[PDB]
Design a protein around this ligand. Structure first.
Ligand SMILES: CC(C)(COP(=O)(O)O)[C@@H](O)C(=O)NCCC(=O)NCCS
Lengths: 737, 83
């Protein structure tokens, strides 16, 4: 009595395959490609409720000059000191920038105004910068469009001899990051397919079965990318470059892994002397639930990212889960159908090398005879990666994570060749009141606030109405001197209800010291306004330093919450399948332990060998996939253990090793190397996350599954399957005749 | 109380799974490391399966002492008669 589901798949293999390919083609043709959809559906880098963006937006609103929260800086560099022709060029550029109303919202002209010209010019006089407030929050499609428009306006124009204009800033860096990721996705896909083709030829030694698994991989990846593009195009969710890169790589990896699992079980059944129909049914009965649970675990683990706060991690959640579900559905339905329809034709899927697994016999014997020593060695090898924690540091500047020739990087280099980091990252603070603050009393109150901000350590200059160029400037005639009017216009609200300060740190503001100094300035301003008519006022502070402070605050929450959610959900799924609490706990805890080795290898390769420290994003993006895939491999091994345990513990384990040793090792290798294949991307952080996941899965395939979990199972014995009741060894059988 | 022939049949089945050597090649005279080219590790797998399926426990220390099939049967014969 064949089960109804594999029978249905086998009997209607051709209609199922045709329906799958038709649906995939419709998905991939109706909507634009994943590159275009990801470009249109780019999301803002920072949360909409972040204090920094809210402060910048409030400053723009009260001053009625812009509505955005992100700005870029146009740096003018010349071989000789800038003069009259450079000033005319700058004035024309500023006028043209202000002309583009839809993209450019406000241009803060400080160099042109003689009152604050000295602050916008380098001490060598060969450089000058202007802050331009582009439309759209950083990271959005509108922000990228505005960055492109500003770059075109500043660059594509006549220039004085020796004078060049560069556009830099966080928004430009994000735009170039997404551009580089989308450009490198094609190379990533090509290299990944070449690598998996070579390794499938190595592990199968047959071109036909390699083509079959490549067809399954193509179907799964096309379905995943098509459904993600279809849902993104209709604004179901946002997208990032990280989301698309992870979607395509994970789709390829999981499709290859499920194809490897199914074909390996089918070929083992054939090797055990079974006809094609019986072998197919055995393969389904032994692998369908395993691959279903693998897909469910990966999808749910990625979906756990949907409950974080940072937009870049939160956005990645749903698309990854949906792609994971679609690829596991394709592998579960089109997989067996393809396998049957191709095994019906000659020696198509028959095993090529009719060779046993001697080494897996040896390692199974070793792990069931001396579990303690092997377990101790494996635990030590997993924990040896923890000694790299003390030397682990993460940086937040994206300068080194992009190619040295992108326009953002060259603008960054030009700006830092003449200006300090504090100048290029000013911190903006304003005080909002309900009164007209154009009186001498309010004026020296503002002066006192500026002095209080200045007295805080680590602060270099404070620009305001009283100190237009960072230094103090009361004559009643001076209030209408045509210079105080301009200073008030540039530093005070049009209705005079708010006053703006431009705090410039002393040193590097983009660091934890800058984050502490932010609260220091907030406290200093609060103290300054105390006991004054400005007491009933609201204080807003923003800037690049504040934005990175918010990001730093978020990062720990994201890491902890995604790790905990993925852990709990994976453990729940393992309990549901294996029906054993201890086995599920072992499966989860083994990869939890291996995470240390994964992290150690990653920071050994990047921080020390390559020299580029790990980005702050790589670990949260990598832990989820590491846990999911490692738990999947352990689950496959444990399910085979449960299948073979009727012969008794300590021999069912050996049979599980010799049964799912080569296939699972090949799957782990292909997954690890296809994730490492993203190291070819121009965006360094994509390569970092890919290589981190690759090293972690390499360690999981080589150690935590071949040595850790079987030794744990042997040590626990009957208790490994608790609360299920199993015997340590079967009833002693009489010696056969 | 199992006879010598019955133990041979049980061992040969374990031999087939562990190594792949045909049951016919297994006779009490053939040596594990000279004739049957069975390494020490493969002997451990043999002991594990026999201890599980038949209950005869052979520790690691005594495993090196056994050299051919005959003394393995004698070891198993010794264990069952003591009972
Ligand atoms: C392993 C052995 C049976 C002798 O080694 P061998 O079987 O390779 O000839 C004996 O030294 C032993 O029992 N050692 C205890 C565990 C050990 O030494 N190594 C386990 C990892 S291979």
């Amino acid at each position: 009595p064949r089960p109804r589901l594999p029978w249905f798949l086998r009997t209607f293999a051709v209609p199922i395959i045709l329906a799958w390919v038709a649906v995939v083609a419709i998905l991939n043709t109706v909507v634009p490609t994943l590159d275009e959809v990801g470009e249109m559906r780019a999301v803002s880098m920072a949360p909409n409720d972040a204090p920094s963006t809210l402060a910048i937006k409030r400053v723009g609103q009260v001053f009625e000059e812009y509505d955005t929260s992100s700005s870029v800086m146009i740096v003018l560099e010349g071989e000789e000191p800038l003069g009259i022709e450079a000033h005319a060029f700058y004035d024309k550029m500023v006028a043209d920038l202000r002309a583009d109303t839809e993209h450019v919202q406000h241009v803060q002209d400080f160099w042109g105004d003689t009152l604050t010209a000295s602050g916008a010019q380098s001490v060598d006089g060969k450089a000058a910068y202007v802050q331009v407030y582009i439309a759209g929050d950083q990271g959005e499609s509108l922000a990228n469009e505005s960055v492109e428009a500003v770059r075109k306006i500043a660059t594509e124009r006549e220039t004085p001899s020796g004078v060049k204009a560069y556009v830099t800033g966080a928004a430009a860096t994000s735009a170039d990051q997404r551009a580089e990721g989308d450009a490198s996705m094609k190379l990533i896909e090509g290299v990944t397919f070449a690598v998996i083709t070579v390794m499938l030829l190595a592990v199968y030694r047959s071109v036909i079965t390699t083509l079959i698994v490549l067809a399954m991989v193509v179907l799964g990846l096309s379905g995943a990318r098509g459904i993600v593009a279809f849902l993104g195009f209709y604004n179901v969710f946002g997208l990032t470059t990280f989301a698309t890169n992870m979607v395509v790589t994970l789709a390829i990896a999981a499709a290859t892994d499920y194809a490897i699992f199914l074909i390996g079980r089918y070929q083992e059944a054939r090797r055990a002397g079974e006809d094609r129909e019986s072998a197919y049914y055995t393969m389904f009965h032994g692998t369908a639930h395993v691959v279903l649970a693998s897909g469910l675990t990966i999808a749910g683990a990625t979906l756990c990212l949907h409950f974080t706060r940072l937009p870049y991690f939160q956005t990645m959640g749903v698309p990854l889960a949906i792609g994971m579900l679609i690829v596991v559905a394709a592998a579960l339905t089109a997989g067996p159908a393809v396998i049957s329809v191709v095994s019906r034709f000659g020696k198509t899927l028959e095993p090529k090398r009719f060779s046993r697994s001697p080494g897996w016999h040896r390692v199974g014997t070793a792990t069931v005879r001396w579990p303690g020593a092997i377990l101790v060695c494996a635990v030590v090898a997993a924990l040896i990666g923890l000694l790299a924690l003390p030397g682990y540091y993460t940086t937040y500047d994206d300068r080194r994570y992009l190619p040295d020739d992108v326009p953002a990087n060259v603008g960054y280099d030009a700006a830092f060749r003449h200006f300090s980091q504090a100048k290029m990252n000013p911190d903006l603070m304003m005080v909002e009141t309900d009164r007209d603050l154009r009186n001498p009393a309010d004026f020296l109150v503002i002066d006192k606030i500026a002095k209080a901000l200045k007295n805080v350590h680590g602060i270099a200059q404070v620009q305001t109405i009283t100190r237009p160029d960072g230094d103090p400037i009361l004559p009643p005639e001076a209030f209408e001197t045509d210079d105080f009017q301009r200073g008030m216009k540039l530093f005070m609200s049009p209705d005079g209800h708010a006053v703006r300060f431009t705090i410039i740190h002393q040193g590097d503001p983009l660091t934890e010291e800058g984050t502490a100094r932010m609260d220091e300035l907030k406290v200093a301003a609060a103290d300054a306004i105390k006991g004054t008519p400005f007491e009933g006022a609201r204080i807003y502070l923003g800037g690049s330093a504040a934005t990175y402070n918010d990001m730093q605050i978020g990062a720990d929450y994201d890491l902890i919450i995604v790790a905990a959610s993925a852990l709990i959900l994976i453990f729940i799924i393992m309990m549901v399948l294996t029906r054993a609490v201890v086995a599920a706990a072992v499966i989860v805890g083994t990869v939890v332990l291996s995470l240390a080795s994964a992290f150690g290898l990653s920071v050994l390769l990047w921080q020390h060998i390559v020299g580029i420290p790990l980005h702050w994003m790589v670990l949260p993006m990598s832990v989820i996939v590491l846990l999911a895939v490692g738990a999947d491999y352990n689950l496959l091994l444990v399910s085979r253990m449960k299948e073979e345990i009727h012969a008794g513990i300590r021999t069912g384990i050996i049979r599980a090793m010799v049964g799912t040793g080569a296939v699972v090792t090949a799957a782990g290798l292909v997954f690890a190397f296809t994730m490492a294949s993203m190291a070819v991307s121009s965006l360094i952080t994509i390569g970092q996350v890919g290589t981190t996941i690759g090293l972690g899965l390499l360690f999981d395939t080589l150690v935590v599954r071949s040595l850790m979990t079987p030794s744990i199972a042997t040590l626990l014995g009957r208790w490994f399957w608790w609360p299920q009741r199993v015997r340590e060894r079967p009833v002693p059988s009489k010696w056969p005749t | 109380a199992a006879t010598q022939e019955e133990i041979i049949a049980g061992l040969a089945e374990i031999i087939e799974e562990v190594t792949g050597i045909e049951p016919s090649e297994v006779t009490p005279e053939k040596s594990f490391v000279d004739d049957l080219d069975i390494d020490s590790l493969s002997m451990v797998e043999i002991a594990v399966q026999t201890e599980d399926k038949y209950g005869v426990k052979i520790p690691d220390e005594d495993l090196a002492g056994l050299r051919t099939v005959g003394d393995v049967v004698a070891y198993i014969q010794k264990l069952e008669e003591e009972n």
